[PDB]
Write a protein that binds this ligand. Structure first.
Ligand code: A1AJ7
Ligand code: A1AJ7
Lengths: 39, 156
């Protein structure tokens, strides 16, 4: 049985940790909602 | 139960102890999460019950108590923040410049940030604090790292 618990406000944080790259990828989305890489 | 706007953990007691299966957003009295998190099951909030209202396996989204309310979109240029809520850890904002998933039906923003699967449903925000989508449905690339789509619904 699933339950929810509050974890915070939804707010932009000034000076948050900045990380992650920005890849441009060719992808396909199937009927099951699963993404796959097209190559 | 609790209906205050904000980010919430989706928990279960079916397995060992209390396990976090995902995350969601409460906005305008509607709870929003990814379909793979709940599989469309009812949810509990204290003594109250949340029934599914709308869902779609292909979009991998579901809303509870009313229709999908989130309609902000990534502008295709600016940095965004993932408000990551990892299992057993405090909510934390992470800023990033999204990449792009290019599909036969158009382009979608993507965030290359890696978190446990139980972080699925954490919101991605624009600079105004608006939810432009949820984290947790994506792909594994050449190196083995994860890239999630910026998954957004449609506000009817
Ligand atoms: C835009 C995207 O498909 C969607 C359309 C509407 C709502 C959600 C999604 C997803 N995921 C695509 N594959 O191009
Ligand atoms: C590779 C995939 O990982 C995720 C799934 C959903 C959300 C985040 C991640 C990550 N990181 C899995 N567990 O199969």
């Amino acid at each position: 049985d699933m339950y929810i618990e509050r974890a915070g406000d939804i707010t932009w944080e000034k000076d948050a940790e900045v990380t992650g790259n920005s890849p441009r990828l060719d992808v396909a989305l199937d009927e099951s909602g699963d993404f796959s890489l097209v190559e | 139960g609790e209906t205050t706007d904000g980010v919430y953990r989706v928990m279960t007691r079916r397995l060992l102890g209390s396990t976090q299966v995902g995350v969601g957003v409460m906005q305008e009295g509607v709870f929003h999460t990814m379909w793979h998190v709940t599989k469309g099951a009812a949810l509990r909030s204290g003594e109250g019950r949340l029934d599914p209202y709308w869902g779609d396996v292909k979009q991998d989204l579901v809303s509870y108590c009313g229709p999908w309310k989130l309609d902000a979109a990534w502008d295709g240029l600016s940095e965004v923040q993932l408000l990551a809520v990892p299992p057993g850890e405090r909510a934390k904002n992470i800023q990033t410049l999204p990449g792009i998933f290019k599909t036969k039906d158009g382009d979608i923003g993507a965030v290359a940030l890696d978190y446990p699967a139980g972080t699925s449903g954490s919101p991605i925000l624009d600079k105004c604090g608006r939810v432009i989508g949820l984290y947790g449905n994506g792909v594994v690339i050449k190196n083995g790292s994860y890239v999630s789509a910026i998954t957004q619904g449609k506000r009817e």
